[PDB]
Design a protein around this ligand. Sequence first.
Ligand SMILES: CCCCCCCC/C=C\CCCCCCCC(=O)OC[C@H](O)CO
Ligand SMILES: CCCCCCCC/C=C\CCCCCCCC(=O)OC[C@H](O)CO
Ligand SMILES: CC(C)(C)NC[C@H](O)COc1cccc2c1CC(C#N)=N2
Ligand SMILES: NC(=O)CN(CC(=O)O)CC(=O)O
Ligand code: NA
Ligand code: NA
Length: 289
Amino acid sequence: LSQQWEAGMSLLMALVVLLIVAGNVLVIAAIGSTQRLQTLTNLFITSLACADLVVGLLVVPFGATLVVRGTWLWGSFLCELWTSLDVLCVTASVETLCVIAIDRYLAITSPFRYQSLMTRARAKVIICTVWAISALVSFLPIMMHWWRDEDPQALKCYQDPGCCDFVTNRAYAIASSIISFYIPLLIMIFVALRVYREAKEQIRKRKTSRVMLMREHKALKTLGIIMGVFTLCWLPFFLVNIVNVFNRDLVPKWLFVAFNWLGYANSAMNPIILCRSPDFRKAFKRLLA
Ligand SMILES: CCCCCCCC/C=C\CCCCCCCC(=O)OC[C@H](O)CO
Ligand SMILES: CCCCCCCC/C=C\CCCCCCCC(=O)OC[C@H](O)CO
Ligand SMILES: CC(C)(C)NC[C@H](O)COc1cccc2c1CC(C#N)=N2
Ligand SMILES: NC(=O)CN(CC(=O)O)CC(=O)O
Ligand code: NA
Ligand code: NA
C-alpha cells in the first residue's frame, strides 16, 4: 500500500514535470519562431519561462523523490545546490514580473521616448542584471551558512545527509523573504494597478485609434493575469514561512509542503494562460501539427 502511493505519486510527478517542461519550451519556441511575438515584453516573458524550466527540470524531480520516499537521497551538497536553485527561480520570477510592470508603465505613459530608447539588446541586459541580482541574494546567503539555526532539531537535520528540510533562523527567514519576494511583489502590484488605471483612462479618451488601443489592452491583460496568478500561488507559502519560523507547531510539515507545491504549480500555469492570448494560440496551433 505504500508501494501504490509511491507508484501513484511517481506517475503524477512525471506528468507535472512533462506539463511544466513542455509548456515552457512551447512558449519559448512560439516567441522564437513568430514575427508577431518578437516584442520586448515577450523577451521578458522568456525570462519567466526559463525560471519555470529550471523548476521543471531540476527542482521538481529532486523534490518529488523527497515527497515519495520521505527522505533525501542525493547527499548534503546537492541538498544545498537544490535549495539555492529553488530560491533563485522564485527570486528571478518575481523580479522579472516587477520589471515587466515598470516597463509597461513607462511604455504607456511615454510611448515616444520609450520606443526611441529601448532595444531588444537593452532588454537582454536588464534580464541579465535580474538573474545576477537574484543569484547574489540567493546563492550567497546559502553558501555562507547565514541561514543555519541552532536548535537540536535543526542541528540533527544538518548532520543528517538524508534530511534536506530548509530549517532556518528567524533573521534569515524574514530578511531573505523581504528581499527575494515581499518587496518586488509589493512594487509589482502597486505599479500594475497604476498601469491598469492609465490603460483604462486611455481607451475612454493618444493619437492611436481606439481599436488599436483595445488590442494593446488585450496584451496588457495577459500580463496582469500572470501577475495575479503568481501572487495567489506564492503568497500563501511566504505567509506560512514566516508564521512557521515563529512557531513551528502552527504549520505542520505536510501542510508547509502542500503550500510549497502550490508555488511550484505556478510554473505549469503560464503556458496555459498564454494559450488564450490570440498571437500565442495561433503559434501553438502551428507548432503542434
Ligand atoms: C509621483 C510620485 C509617486 C511616487 C510613488 C512611487 C513609490 C515607489 C514605486 C515604485 C518603485 C520603482 C522602483 C524602480 C526599480 C526598478 C528598476 C528597473 O530595472 O526597472 C525596469 C526597467 O525600467 C525596464 O525598462
Ligand atoms: C488577487 C490577486 C492580486 C494581485 C494582482 C496583481 C496585479 C494584477 C492587476 C490587475 C488585474 C489584471 C486583469 C485586468 C482585467 C481587466 C479586463 C476587463 O476589462 O475585464 C473583462 C473584459 O471586459 C472582457 O474583455
Ligand atoms: C524546499 C524549499 C523549502 C527549499 N522550497 C523553497 C521555496 O520554493 C522558495 O522559498 C524561498 C524563496 C526565496 C526566498 C526564500 C525562500 C524561503 C526563504 C526562507 N526562510 N527565503
Ligand atoms: N556517501 C556520500 O557520497 C555522501 N554522504 C555524506 C554527505 O552527503 O554529506 C552521504 C551519506 O553519508 O549518506
Ligand atoms: Na516562475
Ligand atoms: Na541534512
